[PDB]
Amino acid sequence: SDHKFLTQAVEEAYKGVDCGDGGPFGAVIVHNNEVVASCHNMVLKYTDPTAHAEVTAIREACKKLNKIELSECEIYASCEPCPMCFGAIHLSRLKRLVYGAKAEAAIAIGFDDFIADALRGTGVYQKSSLEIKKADGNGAAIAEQVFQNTKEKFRLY
Amino acid sequence: SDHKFLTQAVEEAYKGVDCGDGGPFGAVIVHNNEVVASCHNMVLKYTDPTAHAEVTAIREACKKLNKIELSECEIYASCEPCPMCFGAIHLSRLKRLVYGAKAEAAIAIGFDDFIADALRGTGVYQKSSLEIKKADGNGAAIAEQVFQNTKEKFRLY
Numbered sequence A, B: 001s002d003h004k005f006l007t008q009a010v011e012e013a014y015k016g017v018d019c020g021d022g023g024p025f026g027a028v029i030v031h032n033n034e035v036v037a038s039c040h041n042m043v044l045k046y047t048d049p050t051a052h053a054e055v056t057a058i059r060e061a062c063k064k065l066n067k068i069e070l071s072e073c074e075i076y077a078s079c080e081p082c083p084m085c086f087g088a089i090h091l092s093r094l095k096r097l098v099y100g101a102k103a104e105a106a107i108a109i110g111f112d113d114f115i116a117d118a119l120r121g122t123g124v125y126q127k128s129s130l131e132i133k134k135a136d137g138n139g140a141a142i143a144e145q146v147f148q149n150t151k152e153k154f155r156l157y
C-alpha cells in the first residue's frame, strides 16, 4: 500500500512540473487506503509561497472531509517535508507520514537548505509524535530520481 | 511605526475572534509604511488548519503584489509565530518579523505546546538569519493580555 501512494505522490510531482504549476513535489493524503487528496506544488500557479504540495493536500483533504483535523489519515510526500509543511502536518493531526526522498535531493538541484529538525528528531521546542517512515528500495529510487529527471524543467522558487 | 502595526495586529486578533473566523491571532504585512495585508486566523471560517493569521497574511499580500517573495515587506504578528508560520515567513522572504506576545501566553489558555526552534535559535538543521524583534513594554503588554481576554470567546483548535 505504501509504494502505491508514494508513487502517486511522485506522479503528482512530475505532473505539476509538466503543467508549470510549481516544483517537483507531490503529496497524497489517504484514509484507510482511499485517496482523500492528491496534489502537487502550486506556488507558481497560485502566486503563493505557502502552496507547497503538502499544504495544498492538507487544505484539500480538510475541505473534502469538512473538518480541520485528519487524525485518521496518512500523508505520502514525494520529498521530505520542509519545516512549514511539517508544522502544518502537525497541526492537521495526520497520524502518519511516509516520504520518499531526503531533503538533500531537493537541495542538490537548487532549493534552500531548509530542513525540519522535528522530523529528523533534533527538535527541542517542536516535538512531533506522528509516525514517520522514510521509504527504502524502489520507493527511494523513484523519489530521488524525480530531481534528476526534472532538473531544469521548472523555475526555481 | 512598530507600535502602530503591532496594535493593528492585536486588533485583528480581537476582530477575528469576535466574528468567529478563528482564534485570537492577527498578522499585518507592511511595505515601507504601506499596509499590504491585515488578517487574522481563519481556521474556523475556512475549515483550514493552515489558515493561521500569518499564513493568511502572506497569501493575501503575495496575491495583491503579484509576487511570491515579500523581501521588501515586514510582518507584525500579535503572537509569536508557530513552527508552520515561521517556515512560511522564511519561504516568503519577508525581511523582518515583529511579534507581540510569547508563545507561552497562548499555550497558557490551552493551545499546543508547539514552538518554532528556528525562531528561538535552538535547532540543529533549521537556522534563521531573519531579523526578529520581540516587542517590549506597551504594545507587548497589550498583546500578552489578548489570550486571557478572549479565552471564553472561542473553541480551541
Ligand SMILES: O=c1[nH]c(=O)c2ncn([C@@H]3O[C@H](CO)[C@@H](O)[C@H]3O)c2[nH]1
Residues within 6 Å of the ligand: A023, A025, A040, A041, A042, A051, A052, A053, A054, A079, A080, A081, A082, A085, A103, A104, A106, A107, A111, A112, A113, A114, B091
Ligand atoms: O515540502 C515541500 N513542498 C514543496 O512543494 C517544495 N517546493 C520546494 N521545496 C523546498 O525544497 C527544499 C527541501 O525540502 C526546501 O528548501 C523547501 O522549501 C519544497 N518543500
Ligand SMILES: O=c1[nH]c(=O)c2ncn([C@@H]3O[C@H](CO)[C@@H](O)[C@H]3O)c2[nH]1
Residues within 6 Å of the ligand: A091, B023, B025, B040, B041, B042, B051, B052, B053, B054, B079, B080, B081, B082, B085, B103, B104, B106, B107, B111, B112, B113, B114
Ligand atoms: O502562529 C500562529 N497563528 C495562529 O493563527 C494560531 N492559532 C493557534 N495557534 C497556536 O498557538 C500556539 C502558540 O503559537 C501554538 O500551539 C499554535 O499552533 C496559532 N499560531
Ligand SMILES: [Zn+2]
Residues within 6 Å of the ligand: A052, A053, A054, A081, A082, A083, A084, A085, A086
Ligand atoms: Zn513544504
Ligand SMILES: [Zn+2]
Residues within 6 Å of the ligand: B052, B053, B054, B081, B082, B083, B084, B085, B086
Ligand atoms: Zn502559525
